[PDB]
Design an enzyme around this catalytic site. Structure first.
Site, PDB file in Angstrom:
ATOM      1  NE  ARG A   1      12.973  29.034 -22.450  1.00  0.00           N
ATOM      2  CZ  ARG A   1      11.939  28.544 -23.133  1.00  0.00           C
ATOM      3  NH1 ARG A   1      12.001  27.337 -23.682  1.00  0.00           N
ATOM      4  NH2 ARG A   1      10.835  29.267 -23.267  1.00  0.00           N
TER       5      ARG A   1
ATOM      6  CG  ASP B   1      24.128   7.035 -24.199  1.00  0.00           C
ATOM      7  OD1 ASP B   1      23.142   7.065 -24.967  1.00  0.00           O
ATOM      8  OD2 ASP B   1      25.202   7.617 -24.469  1.00  0.00           O
TER       9      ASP B   1
ATOM     10  CG  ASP C   1      26.226  17.706 -20.784  1.00  0.00           C
ATOM     11  OD1 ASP C   1      25.854  18.196 -21.875  1.00  0.00           O
ATOM     12  OD2 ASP C   1      26.682  18.396 -19.842  1.00  0.00           O
TER      13      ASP C   1
END
Ligand SMILES: Nc1nc2c(ncn2[C@@H]2O[C@H](COP(=O)(O)O)[C@@H](O)[C@H]2O)c(=O)[nH]1
Ligand SMILES: Nc1nc2c(ncn2[C@@H]2O[C@H](COP(=O)(O)O)[C@@H](O)[C@H]2O)c(=O)[nH]1
Lengths: 196, 205
Positions: B187, B125, B122
């Site tokens: 969600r 970093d 996803d």
């Protein structure tokens, strides 16, 4: 309130899906198809909140911009069928009405003048004047794009998707030519492509 | 061409610009990237992936960090292209969890040999996880190893790792929406958004 697309705001050509042969004619992407879709969804939501209480008659101004109409109506319809009470929704097209005459059918109704791109306001203001002569419950103006023309000699519309710079845009179905028929994103054109 | 879409520090949209569930707005400041742009980009990333790896068996290694929305979407676009090509290639999906390190699926690191492996995550970093995995996969001599990612955050804590297929370069602000895990409190949120101080307070613990 519209989404504010800054002057130098935009995207690279390789950022999204654009067919290879069009690339030669384009500078950059202004608004991707997905943003357009997402914004049209909210416009449709805004329309129903304001007009969904009574029979809506959408008046689409034919400038060769079918795609915006299709998506806007689709979301309107989806909201109409998802709401607890269904509402009559008539769609006509103006060139004179293709439907259509008389325009007396506009009385007591919620009228939405739908244009894909407002440049001067001329075309819209004429219809605004025209429909008001038939005593409708309300008149609102929906539009995907308003160009920030210094020569903006008209009104501020009710439902507007994006505020864009005063450049020539193609893609989606904004260009009246069928030369960028497969371009899904709103793109501004280079020097080679503006021929035309 | 493979360069990610740049989302400037001040880039973004008003919460009223797009469709956001009313209850979420209290906890959000702005929309960073709308669902539609995300989808458009993912579609391009899939084409990119296929241009590079569509020549042989692709094993997609999905790194378990919360949701799998991005994995599912990326792959659906990849699958569509794999159907509509002259020579269709096999494709395997495996989930992976860091600790260390075990593959969830039919494959093992050892069975990755001779295959086009795509490591999917996803958000990058620090870059530490990806570098570790890259080194792990390379020990088993795959045909190629490529790294795909939806987001990269710009942090001084970045280790210099350059992924192959990244969608968006984003600021160092904590973001929620789409596939980004928030312990499933957002969600029903489709757009990538910034959380306000009140929303960050609602996350604890
Ligand atoms: N194809 C195209 N036509 C435009 C654009 N802006 C204004 N026009 C056209 O100029 C006229 C004013 C309208 O009829 C409209 O169709 C544009 O960006 N692209
Ligand atoms: N939702 C969300 N999770 C993040 C972000 N940055 C790092 N993380 C999470 O923090 C962990 C490191 C990962 O599990 C990753 O999912 C972010 O910007 N948004």
């Amino acid at each position: 309130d519209p989404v504010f697309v800054k002057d130098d705001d935009g995207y690279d050509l390789d950022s999204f899906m654009i067919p290879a042969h069009y690339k030669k004619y384009l500078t950059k992407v202004l608004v991707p198809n997905g943003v357009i879709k997402n914004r049209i969804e909210k416009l449709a939501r805004d329309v129903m909140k304001e007009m969904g209480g009574h029979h809506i008659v959408a008046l689409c101004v034919l400038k060769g911009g079918y795609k915006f109409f299709a998506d806007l109506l689709d979301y309107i319809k989806a909201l109409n069928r998802n709401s607890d009470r269904s509402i009559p929704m008539t769609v006509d097209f103006i060139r004179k009405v293709i439907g259509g005459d008389d325009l007396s059918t506009l009385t007591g109704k919620n009228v939405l003048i739908v244009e894909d791109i407002i440049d001067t306001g001329k075309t819209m203001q004429t219809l605004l004047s025209l429909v008001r002569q038939y005593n409708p419950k309300m008149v609102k103006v929906a539009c995907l794009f308003i160009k920030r023309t210094p020569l903006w000699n008209g009104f501020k519309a009710d439902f507007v998707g994006f505020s864009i710079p005063d450049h020539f845009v193609v893609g989606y179905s904004l260009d009246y030519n069928e030369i960028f028929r497969d371009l899904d994103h709103c793109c501004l054109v280079n020097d080679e492509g503006k021929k035309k």
